[PDB]
């Protein structure tokens, strides 16, 4: 019927939006998940619109 799957109820693992490594941390400001202080520093210095570009790979962009 072309209607054929449903979301999981298992809780979701957290991965770094930049590097895909496991992420302990969720940035409050930019909503990116990040692995460590090195990537938090880089995340806060992204060019305009690059934060949304990282959310797009997760399918989580603002629209």
């Amino acid at each position: 019927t072309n209607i054929e799957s449903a979301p999981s109820l298992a809780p979701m693992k957290h991965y770094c939006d930049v590097t895909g490594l496991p992420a302990p941390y969720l940035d409050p400001k930019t909503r990116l998940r990040y692995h460590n202080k090195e990537i938090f520093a880089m995340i806060r210095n992204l060019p305009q619109g690059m934060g949304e570009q990282f959310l797009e790979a997760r399918g989580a962009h603002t629209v």
């Binding site: 302990p24 969720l26 409050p28 400001k29 460590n36 938090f40």
Partner: peptide
Amino acid sequence: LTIKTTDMEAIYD
């Protein structure tokens, strides 16, 4: 909870 160091900041549910 929002928490920070000088090097990082995070929200936790």
